[PDB]
Each structure stands twice: as structure tokens, then as C-alpha cells.
RNA sequence: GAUGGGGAAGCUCCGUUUCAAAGGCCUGAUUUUAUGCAGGCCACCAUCGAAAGGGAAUCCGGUUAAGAUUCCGGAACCUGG
RNA sequence: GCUUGUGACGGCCCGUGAAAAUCCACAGGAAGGAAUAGUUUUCAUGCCAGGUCGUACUGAUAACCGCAGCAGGUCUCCAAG
RNA sequence: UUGACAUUGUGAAGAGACAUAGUUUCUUUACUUAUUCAAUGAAGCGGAGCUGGAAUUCAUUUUCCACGUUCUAGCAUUCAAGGUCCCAUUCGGGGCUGAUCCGGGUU
């Protein structure tokens, strides 16, 4: 693999030559959603403190 | 006389464990800051077969909170714990199967496994294919906790001593007839050189306390004292009763 | 006033000044002369019948050469002791513990000429 | 403001690596360090005998400063000065013909352990400083009692090196004055009295007081709260 | 199987990362100059142990009394620079 | 068809059937870098270099071990109708 | 294996004798610095304080706990972004705070 043009060892995507794309799909989705929920977790218990 | 077999095993030559294929030593996390002021999460990236072990191991990786990098521990899989699962380790940690908690924090009745003897000895009690321990009570002043082991012996250890929620996997292993010589053959193949066993009664006197005679017979009492010296101790050492156990067992 | 700040919990041997040798007298009075000059490198020509045949046909010079000498040292010294240029040197230790260099000249030089210039034939 | 942003890092278990912090409390020192700290500690935890614990009671910085001030005037001859003196009598004395006395009478501090001791013993010393370091403490433990017995006023001082410097040694263990120029007698009898007040006088009393028996402050507090709660409910 | 060690009258026995102050890379600082200090790392702490295990890369043709995937011829490939 | 190679599967286990050197990838983004001309050697082409030791032959009813050119012993590949 | 002596020190309650002053000796139970055992690239110990708050006020606090993470098989590193101070404004770099205080007893 050290005698080979870099294109043979990759595909042109996020996390290219390293995870199976349906894997990338998954960890994008979960990334977005968990980062979002983080917002829904904060402001919600920001209300808890104010309504207690 | 010759050095009898049980003596030879101690100098550990052709005896020593068969070590080579074994996932590594099973252990709890070191008892750091996190685990004794709060809790810390990790994922079981893999549950797997240790060789010469009854119960499945559980590869469980954590973050290292003092350097950006992953640090993987090796757990004995309790039952029902599964890949992808989140695992919690700490004093202030919820109480579900698979988590590791100090015995001080689990209500009595709790069932736990791979428990520490002293706190922070990374597991040492009930680690075997099936076993567990029952927390049977606490004493807050001098924070001890009382538990029952698989032996039925009750023991009191410190409450900071951790142990993991649930029971060990591989349940019922000993319930299946080994069936033939080969199965035990392959059983001990990956344990140590202890099988097969010649009977001391089948040897000559040079070889064993029992050896010789023109009939096969132990010739003297086989309940042998504690104080008995090396090369004497073969048979029922320190035996306080002997014979078929009549009547119920179970520690009263 | 106050103390040091160490962010690491590990201690190490303080990197200390490594002073260099300034001998009060000398190693060996006189440095040794070159222990393997060209002349010591290449010992005799080889002139077995079958050796020669490589000189007519092959453009190759055959030298019983120093055991202590490698493919480089052989090339440089055939080069300098004989005016010629070398394509390639193969070597082999004889079954009598003497080393043989199949030395092959480049196509500018006619080995057979070069052979009975040094004077064997 | 700009297109800059506040992102404050959470460090509360479970999340974000800890930052670099100061761990000087937590470092694996070289054993020689451990041994020398543990040594000092062990020496305070035991119950040290009165004829040792009478040291530790050192002179104070004010008084001492006055003592080193006075003694400095009396340093012993220098490298140069002696060579310089010797030719002011090699030449001078031998020819002009003095009694080996075209040199003035020397007024210097006395030092060297065996030296000072005979001095004390002969009641010729008039003010003696004993060091407080001195590792074979035995070398010097008897010095208080001696002076006391010989009725020679004494003071335990900080600095076996500070004793050393004033006499051109690295270390000295003891400094002593026997002689003193009259123009200095004033300043000395002063010092003798303050000194005697803190040492020779208090000596008999120091003789009964075992030092040490001091807890580490983990355990010192552990009972400072236990003895605090148990009694006063 | 050395080493900091610990045993042993001693030949030597134990231990192999273990109660140890265990060591070296990247380029920067030089433009007195050759390499001092400046960062930041990295704590992995001997070595021996396989011509059947792992492993960078070559083939065909021709040639000798006796060598050849090693020479001759043609055509390749790997590694360093 | 035979021999061997190989794939997708299936059975078996209280047996679930090495390790390290080594090579690549990706996450990361410190950094360096263009318009009067920069960046680029994981694209092509081009130059120099590759040491040391072994290389013969027997491998057995005579080249090894059994006092020997001993009916014994001594690990393996290729395999026609 | 069992006893004695040595290693072996510090307190407190109770015994034990000049025959009901405390030198000494032992039973019990404290101490931690000797010895002992464990873990860790000796990382967060001990003590105080800020905030919350249950708590019930017998003058105001006498106290007790809390004092960043739990639907998810993602992501967490460049002495940290931010804030403020300095260099003399260059690119770069430094202090402090962000991350409270004290004791250096690694636990
Ligand atoms: Mg591709
Ligand atoms: Mg492709
Ligand atoms: Mg072993
Ligand atoms: Mg067997
Ligand atoms: Mg049997
Ligand atoms: Mg049997
Ligand atoms: Mg028999
Ligand atoms: Mg017998
Ligand atoms: Mg018997
Ligand atoms: Mg018998
Ligand atoms: Mg029988
Ligand atoms: Mg020709
Ligand atoms: Mg060769
Ligand atoms: Mg003078
Ligand atoms: Mg050894
Ligand atoms: Mg090797
Ligand atoms: Mg090999
Ligand atoms: Mg051929
Ligand atoms: Mg030939
Ligand atoms: Mg041949
Ligand atoms: Mg060729
Ligand atoms: Mg060519
Ligand atoms: Mg190249
Ligand atoms: Mg076959
Ligand atoms: Mg399988
Ligand atoms: Mg790859
Ligand atoms: Mg290229
Ligand atoms: Mg080289
Ligand atoms: Mg051959
Ligand atoms: Mg052959
Ligand atoms: Mg033959
Ligand atoms: Mg033979
Ligand atoms: Mg034969
Ligand atoms: Mg620690
Ligand atoms: Mg920068």
C-alpha cells in the first residue's frame, strides 16, 4: 500500500477509506440529533430551576 | 521414596498455566477520582471468549479524563449485558445490570459479581461462570457491608469496595455431561497439566503414601492431619467429617 | 518567596552538561597506517584454465582478493591499480578460505589486453 | 464580540479532559528526597529527649544579627594578610631586631571543636556560639551543659555555614570569643546578657522538656474536630 | 538473560519494569560557529530466541567437465538517495 | 475426471483455534502557500547506489546415525495410461 | 506449631505493690512514626470558603446534606475559547482570570 497512488487507498467522502458510508450516514445522523437534543436538554431544565 | 506428585506441581515446570490464548486479565477500572466521587461512562465494544475460562469476557472502552485517548478495560460479562451498551462505573451511578458500584450504595438484596475484597483491588470475588454475591446488610459507622459469597460463607468488606450489578455469564456450564475422555482432554488442554489422574493406590510405595500392597488398598486412614508435613498430605486433608452427606446442606 | 510549578507527576534526571573528552595524553602515539591499501586488497590474479576462459570470452578479470575486503574495496582498487573501470564485482569464498573476485570491466576495456599487460597469460 | 465566541469548557467528570494543573503535591520524588523529608518528619513524631530538644530553641534573628555583626570585626587572618604580615617581621623583626614583636597582639574569634572545648574547660572563653545543624549531634550536645557548668555564657545559633563563613571555612560547628578589644567590651557584655537570658538561664528549665510528639496535620485536624464535637455538643 | 536492586561465607541465587533521579525525536534558536539553548512532545526502560511462523522487490531463454531464480542475453521490480 | 488452488456457505466445541516488526488509511488542523506569479513530488519521465556470510554434491539397501559400502533408523514437495 | 526474649514506641479506662500520694508491671482500647500489605505513567487528599437548599429560628444561625455528565454504538487533544492586563504595536508572545483558599502527609 506504500507503492500505490493515494486514490487506491481512499474514497472521496468524509471518513473515506476508513468506515463503510452507511456507517458515516449513521454517525452524521446521530451527531446532528444528539447535538440538537443537547439544546432541548438545556433550556428545558433552565425552566426547571426557574419554576421550582 | 520418590517426591510424590503433588509436591512436584509446586516447582511448576510442566505444570504452570497455559496462559497463551487468553484475552488478558479481567479487572475493574483503577479506582480513580471519577469512580469514587461520581461515575463515568463506557461502551462494551465486544463481549468475547477467554480461553480456559467459563464465562465470557467483556471489552469495555472508556475515555481517559487526563489525556485525550481511549482506555479499554477488560470485564467479565455479567448476564444480559450487550455490545453497544452503556456501562456506568461510580459511587453516584444508577443501579442497573452491568454497572459497577460501591457496595455501600446498593440496597440490600442487590446481586453483584466480580467484587473487590479490599476496595480498589479491581475485582476478586465471584468471577466464575455463574456465581455472584448477595449484599446482606450494611453498617454505616465504620462503613462496612456484609455479603454472602458463592461458598455460602458470609463475609464483611468495606463499603467503598466495588462489585458489578448482575450475575456472571456462562450459567449452567457444569450441567452438561463431559461425556467422553476427549472433552475433558480439551477442557484441560487450555487450563493446565492436571489431567488425567493416576490413583495413588495404583502406584508403588516409592511414589505415594497409598502405593503398593498385594491388593489395592490405602492401608491406613486417609484423613490426614493439618500439621502433616509435605509428602504426607495426600487424601482427605484436615477432614472434619467424612462419608456421604446425608440430609440437607445450605448454611443455616 | 514560593515554590516550583510542576505540571507532571513524574520526575526525571535533570538534563545535565555532558562535557567532552580533552585527554591529558594520547591514545596510541602513532595512528595505524592503512590496514587495507589497494595492494593488500587484491592478492594474486587467478589463472586457472577455466579462469582465463572468462577473460577471453567474458571481459572479466579474476583476482584472489582479501577476505577482509568487500565488493566496494575490490572495485576501487582494481580501478586504481589498473587504470580500468568496473561494471560489476561478484565475489565468492573459495573452498580453501581465500576469496575470489569475478571483476567485470566495462565495455571500453579489453580485459585480455589488460591481462597480459599485468603479465599473465 | 467580533466573530469571536465564548465556549466555556466544562470540567465536571464525564466530560472534557482535565486541564494541566499543579501537581507538586503529587510528584514521585527521588528517594533521597523522600528519605530527607521522612527523616525530619520521624524526628518530630517521636518523643525527643530534653538534652536534644534543647536545640531547636535557636537564637532569634535580631539578637543574632547583632552577634554576627560583632564577631565579624574579629575574623581570623586572611591568605594575603598573613603572608603580608610575615614579611613585616621576616624583614622587620629579624633585622631591625624586635622580640618577634613588631607584630601587634592578635584579636580573633576562636573556632574548631576541640579548640573551643579546652577553652570552655579553662574558663577562658567568654561567649560561645554552638551550631544547630551538626549531624552527629553528639559532637555538640554536651556543649550547653559544659558552658553551664563552666559558667561560660552560650547561645545556640542558626547556621553551621553562617558560622563557617565568618571564619573562612565552609562550615564551622562552633565560634568563640575569648579576647575582645576594650572598645568592643561594651557591645559584648550587652550580648552576653540577652543571650544568657534565653539560654544559660532557661537551661535548667529546658532540661525537663521532651520535644516532639507532633501529629501530621491530616491527623492533627482529625482529632481537632473529634475533640471539638465529642465534648461541646 | 544483563541492569537499579534484594539474598548468599562464597562460586553465585532472585527478580526483568520490578521499591530506580533509567532516555531521544523534530525542527526551531546560529548567520562570532558550529551546533549551545528555546518550545512541544513520547514514558515505549535492555538484549537473545525461528535457514518450517511474520517478511520490500525477478522472470523467461541460453550457457558449464563440474555453477546458476546467482553468469550471459532480453525484459522487470523493490528499497535508499 | 485427477491433483492443487480459491469462494460463497454449513457442522463442531465446558476446545472458539499466536505475537511482534512492519505498511496504509482516516479524525484532527499547528502551520505554509497565488496574479505579475506562487504552491505542488502519494501523476508521468529522468539520475546515482544496494554491503556482509551461505550457494558444490549425498540425502540414503554405499556420502547421515547404528564399530561397516549393516535387510535397522532417519522430516518433507512434485506424481502419467 | 506453641511460649519467652529481642525488633517495641505514644496515650486513656481497669487491675497490680513501699503497705489508700505514683516510679513500675500487666488485661482492655486508642495513637502513627517503626515494621506490614495494596494501587497508581504517585491526579485531584485533608482542612477552610463561596453558592443552593432541606432544616426550626427561641435572637440569628445552632446545624445537616448537597455544591456540572444517564432516551441514542456520534463528537471531546494544540498551556482553551471568552474576559482583562502588558510588549510599544507585526507576525508573534507573555501574565492573570476562566479553574476560589490554606497544608506540600501520593492514596
Ligand atoms: Mg478509490
Ligand atoms: Mg480502485
Ligand atoms: Mg506463567
Ligand atoms: Mg498429562
Ligand atoms: Mg484416575
Ligand atoms: Mg481419578
Ligand atoms: Mg502397580
Ligand atoms: Mg512411602
Ligand atoms: Mg502414612
Ligand atoms: Mg497400598
Ligand atoms: Mg481397592
Ligand atoms: Mg573480447
Ligand atoms: Mg555471494
Ligand atoms: Mg582584621
Ligand atoms: Mg537472571
Ligand atoms: Mg533476534
Ligand atoms: Mg524466517
Ligand atoms: Mg536455465
Ligand atoms: Mg564456471
Ligand atoms: Mg547442478
Ligand atoms: Mg541480468
Ligand atoms: Mg536493461
Ligand atoms: Mg525512490
Ligand atoms: Mg498433498
Ligand atoms: Mg469461528
Ligand atoms: Mg489500508
Ligand atoms: Mg512517484
Ligand atoms: Mg549502513
Ligand atoms: Mg544446488
Ligand atoms: Mg541434491
Ligand atoms: Mg548414493
Ligand atoms: Mg557413517
Ligand atoms: Mg543400511
Ligand atoms: Mg495514586
Ligand atoms: Mg503560534
UniProtKB/Swiss-Prot annotation, chain A:
Other comments on record: Present with 23600 molecules/cell in log phase SD medium.
Localization of this protein: Cytoplasm
Stated family: Belongs to the eukaryotic ribosomal protein eL34 family.
Range within the parent protein: 62 to 113 of 121
Superkingdom classification of source: Eukaryota
Subunit: Component of the large ribosomal subunit (LSU). Mature yeast ribosomes consist of a small (40S) and a large (60S) subunit. The 40S small subunit contains 1 molecule of ribosomal RNA (18S rRNA) and 33 different proteins (encoded by 57 genes). The large 60S subunit contains 3 rRNA molecules (25S, 5.8S and 5S rRNA) and 46 different proteins (encoded by 81 genes).
Functional summary from the UniProt entry: Component of the ribosome, a large ribonucleoprotein complex responsible for the synthesis of proteins in the cell. The small ribosomal subunit (SSU) binds messenger RNAs (mRNAs) and translates the encoded message by selecting cognate aminoacyl-transfer RNA (tRNA) molecules. The large subunit (LSU) contains the ribosomal catalytic site termed the peptidyl transferase center (PTC), which catalyzes the formation of peptide bonds, thereby polymerizing the amino acids delivered by tRNAs into a polypeptide chain.
Gene name as annotated: RPL34A
Protein name per Swiss-Prot or TrEMBL: Large ribosomal subunit protein eL34A
Signal peptide: none
UniProtKB/Swiss-Prot annotation, chain B:
Subcellular location: Cytoplasm
GO biological processes: cytoplasmic translation; maintenance of translational fidelity; ribosomal large subunit biogenesis
Pfam families referenced in this protein's UniProt entry, alphabetically: Ribosomal_L2, Ribosomal_L2_C
Main localisation: cytoplasm
Matching InterPro entries: NA-bd_OB-fold, Rib_uL2_dom2, Ribosomal_uL2, Ribosomal_uL2_C, Ribosomal_uL2_CS, Ribosomal_uL2_dom3, Ribosomal_uL2_RNA-bd_dom, Translation_prot_SH3-like_sf
Positions of modified residues (Phosphoserine): 51, 94, 158-159, 248
Gene Ontology molecular functions: RNA binding; rRNA binding; structural constituent of ribosome
Gene Ontology annotations for the cellular component aspect, listed alphabetically: cytosol; cytosolic large ribosomal subunit
Location of cross-link Glycyl lysine isopeptide (Lys-Gly) (interchain with G-Cter in ubiquitin): 45, 92, 118, 144
PANTHER family linked: LARGE RIBOSOMAL SUBUNIT PROTEIN UL2 (PTHR13691:SF16), RIBOSOMAL PROTEIN L2 (PTHR13691)
Oligomer status and interactors: Component of the large ribosomal subunit (LSU). Mature yeast ribosomes consist of a small (40S) and a large (60S) subunit. The 40S small subunit contains 1 molecule of ribosomal RNA (18S rRNA) and 33 different proteins (encoded by 57 genes). The large 60S subunit contains 3 rRNA molecules (25S, 5.8S and 5S rRNA) and 46 different proteins (encoded by 81 genes).
Misc remark: There are 2 genes for uL2 in yeast.
Family: Belongs to the universal ribosomal protein uL2 family.
Protein name: Large ribosomal subunit protein uL2A
Organism (species): Saccharomyces cerevisiae (strain ATCC 204508 / S288c) (Baker's yeast)
Organism classification: Eukaryota, Fungi, Dikarya, Ascomycota, Saccharomycotina
Name of the coding gene: RPL2A
Curated annotation (Swiss-Prot), chain C:
SUPFAM superfamilies referenced in this protein's UniProt entry, alphabetically: Ribosomal proteins S24e, L23 and L15e
GO biological process: cytoplasmic translation; ribosomal large subunit assembly
Cross-link (Glycyl lysine isopeptide (Lys-Gly) (interchain with G-Cter in SUMO)): 40
The keyword Ribosomal protein appears for this protein: yes
Gene3D superfamilies: 3.30.70.330
GO CC annotation terms, alphabetical: cytosol; cytosolic large ribosomal subunit; preribosome, large subunit precursor
InterPro entries named in the record: Nucleotide-bd_a/b_plait_sf, Ribosomal_uL23-like, Ribosomal_uL23/eL15/eS24_sf, Ribosomal_uL23_CS, Ribosomal_uL23_N
Annotated compartments: Cytoplasm
Role summary: Component of the ribosome, a large ribonucleoprotein complex responsible for the synthesis of proteins in the cell. The small ribosomal subunit (SSU) binds messenger RNAs (mRNAs) and translates the encoded message by selecting cognate aminoacyl-transfer RNA (tRNA) molecules. The large subunit (LSU) contains the ribosomal catalytic site termed the peptidyl transferase center (PTC), which catalyzes the formation of peptide bonds, thereby polymerizing the amino acids delivered by tRNAs into a polypeptide chain.
Sequence similarity: Belongs to the universal ribosomal protein uL23 family.
Name of protein: Large ribosomal subunit protein uL23
Source organism per UniProt: Saccharomyces cerevisiae (strain ATCC 204508 / S288c)
This protein's encoding gene: RPL25
Curated annotation (Swiss-Prot), chain D:
A biological-process GO annotation: maturation of LSU-rRNA
PROSITE patterns recorded: RIBOSOMAL_L7AE (PS01082)
Entry GO terms, CC: cytosol; cytosolic large ribosomal subunit
Xref: SUPFAM superfamilies: L30e-like
Source superkingdom: Eukaryota
Keywords: Cytoplasm, Ribonucleoprotein, Ribosomal protein
GO molecular function, one term: structural constituent of ribosome
Localization of this protein: Cytoplasm
Pfam families: Ribosomal_L7Ae (PF01248)
Role of this protein: Component of the ribosome, a large ribonucleoprotein complex responsible for the synthesis of proteins in the cell. The small ribosomal subunit (SSU) binds messenger RNAs (mRNAs) and translates the encoded message by selecting cognate aminoacyl-transfer RNA (tRNA) molecules. The large subunit (LSU) contains the ribosomal catalytic site termed the peptidyl transferase center (PTC), which catalyzes the formation of peptide bonds, thereby polymerizing the amino acids delivered by tRNAs into a polypeptide chain.
Similarity remark: Belongs to the eukaryotic ribosomal protein eL8 family.
Subunit structure and binding partners: Component of the large ribosomal subunit (LSU). Mature yeast ribosomes consist of a small (40S) and a large (60S) subunit. The 40S small subunit contains 1 molecule of ribosomal RNA (18S rRNA) and 33 different proteins (encoded by 57 genes). The large 60S subunit contains 3 rRNA molecules (25S, 5.8S and 5S rRNA) and 46 different proteins (encoded by 81 genes).
Note: Present with 238000 molecules/cell in log phase SD medium. There are 2 genes for eL8 in yeast.
Amino acid at each position: 500500500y506504500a507503492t500505490v497512488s493515494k486514490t487506491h487507498k481512499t474514497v472521496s467522502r468524509a471518513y473515506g477509506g476508513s468506515r463503510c458510508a452507511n456507517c458515516v450516514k449513521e454517525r452524521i445522523i446521530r451527531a446532528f440529533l444528539i447535538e440538537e437534543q443537547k439544546i432541548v436538554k438545556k433550556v428545558v431544565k433552565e425552566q426547571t430551576e426557574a419554576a421550582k | 521414596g520418590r517426591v510424590i506428585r503433588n509436591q512436584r506441581k509446586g516447582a511448576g515446570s510442566i505444570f504452570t498455566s497455559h496462559t497463551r490464548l487468553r484475552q488478558g486479565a479481567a479487572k475493574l477500572r483503577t479506582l480513580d477520582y471519577a469512580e469514587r466521587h461520581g461515575y463515568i461512562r463506557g461502551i462494551v465494544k465486544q463481549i468475547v471468549h477467554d480461553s480456559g475460562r467459563g464465562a465470557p469476557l467483556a471489552k469495555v472502552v472508556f475515555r481517559d479524563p487526563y489525556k485525550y485517548r481511549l482506555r479499554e478495560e477488560i470485564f467479565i460479562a455479567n448476564e444480559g449485558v450487550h455490545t453497544g451498551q452503556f456501562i456506568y462505573a461510580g459511587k453516584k451511578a444508577s443501579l442497573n445490570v452491568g454497572n459497577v458500584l460501591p457496595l455501600g450504595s446498593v440496597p440490600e438484596g442487590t446481586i453483584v459479581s466480580n467484587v473487590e475484597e479490599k476496595p480498589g483491588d479491581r475485582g476478586a470475588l465471584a468471577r466464575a461462570s455463574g456465581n455472584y454475591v448477595i449484599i446482606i446488610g450494611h453498617n454505616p459507622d465504620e462503613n462496612k457491608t456484609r455479603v454472602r459469597l458463592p461458598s455460602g460463607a458470609k463475609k464483611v468488606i468495606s463499603s467503598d469496595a466495588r462489585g458489578v450489578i448482575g450475575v456472571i455469564a456462562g450459567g449452567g456450564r457444569v450441567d452438561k455431561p463431559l461425556l467422553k475422555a476427549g472433552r475433558a482432554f480439551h477442557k484441560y488442554r487450555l487450563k493446565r497439566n492436571s489431567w488425567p489422574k493416576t490413583r495413588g493406590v495404583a502406584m508403588n510405595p516409592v511414589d505415594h503414601p497409598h502405593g503398593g500392597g498385594n491388593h489395592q488398598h490405602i492401608g491406613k486412614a486417609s484423613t490426614i492431619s493439618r500439621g502433616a508435613v509435605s509428602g504426607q498430605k495426600a487424601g482427605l486433608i484436615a477432614a472434619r467429617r467424612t462419608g456421604l452427606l446425608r440430609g440437607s446442606q445450605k448454611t443455616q | 518567596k514560593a515554590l516550583k510549578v510542576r505540571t507532571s507527576a513524574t520526575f526525571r534526571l535533570p538534563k545535565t552538561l555532558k562535557l567532552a573528552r580533552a585527554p591529558k595524553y594520547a591514545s596510541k602515539a602513532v595512528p595505524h597506517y592503512n590496514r587495507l591499501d589497494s595492494y593488500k586488497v587484491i592478492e594474486q590474479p587467478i589463472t586457472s584454465e577455466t579462469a582465463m576462459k572468462k577473460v577471453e570470452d567474458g571481459n572479466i578479470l579474476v583476482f584472489q582478493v582479501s577476505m577482509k575486503a568487500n565488493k566496494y574495496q575490490i572495485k576501487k582498487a582494481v580501478k586504481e591499480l589498473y587504470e580500468v573501470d568496473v561494471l560489476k564485482v561478484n565475489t565468492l569464498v573459495r573452498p580453501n578460505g581465500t576469496k575470489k573476485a569475478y571483476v567485470r570491466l566495462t565495455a571500453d576495456y579489453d580485459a585480455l589486453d589488460i591481462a597480459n599487460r599485468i603479465g599473465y597469460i | 464580540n467580533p466573530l469571536t465566541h465564548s465556549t466555556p469548557k466544562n470540567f465536571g467528570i464525564g466530560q472534557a479532559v482535565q486541564p494541566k494543573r499543579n501537581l507538586s503535591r503529587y510528584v514521585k520524588w527521588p528517594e533521597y528526597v523522600r528519605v530527607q523529608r521522612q527523616k525530619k518528619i520521624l524526628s518530630i513524631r517521636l518523643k525527643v529527649p530534653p538534652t536534644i530538644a534543647q536545640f531547636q530553641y535557636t537564637l532569634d534573628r535580631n539578637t543574632a544579627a547583632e552577634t554576627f555583626k560583632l564577631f565579624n570585626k574579629y575574623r581570623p587572618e586572611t591568605a594575603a594578610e598573613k603572608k603580608e604580615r610575615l614579611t613585616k617581621e621576616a624583614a622587620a623583626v629579624a633585622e631591625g631586631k624586635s622580640k618577634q614583636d613588631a607584630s601587634p597582639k592578635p584579636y580573633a574569634v576562636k573556632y574548631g571543636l576541640n579548640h573551643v572545648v579546652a577553652l570552655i574547660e579553662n574558663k577562658k572563653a567568654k561567649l560561645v556560639l554552638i551550631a544547630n545543624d551538626v549531624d552527629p549531634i553528639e559532637l555538640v550536645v554536651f556543649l550547653p551543659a559544659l558552658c553551664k557548668k563552666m559558667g561560660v555564657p552560650y547561645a545556640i545559633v542558626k547556621g553551621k555555614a553562617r558560622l563557617g563563613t565568618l571564619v573562612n571555612q565552609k562550615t564551622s560547628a562552633v565560634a568563640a570569643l575569648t579576647e575582645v578589644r576594650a572598645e568592643d567590651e561594651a557591645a559584648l557584655a550587652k550580648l552576653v546578657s540577652t543571650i544568657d537570658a534565653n539560654f544559660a538561664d532557661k537551661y535548667d528549665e529546658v532540661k525537663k522538656h521532651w520535644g516532639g510528639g507532633i501529629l501530621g496535620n491530616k491527623a492533627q485536624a482529625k482529632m481537632d474536630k473529634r475533640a471539638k464535637n465529642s465534648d461541646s455538643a
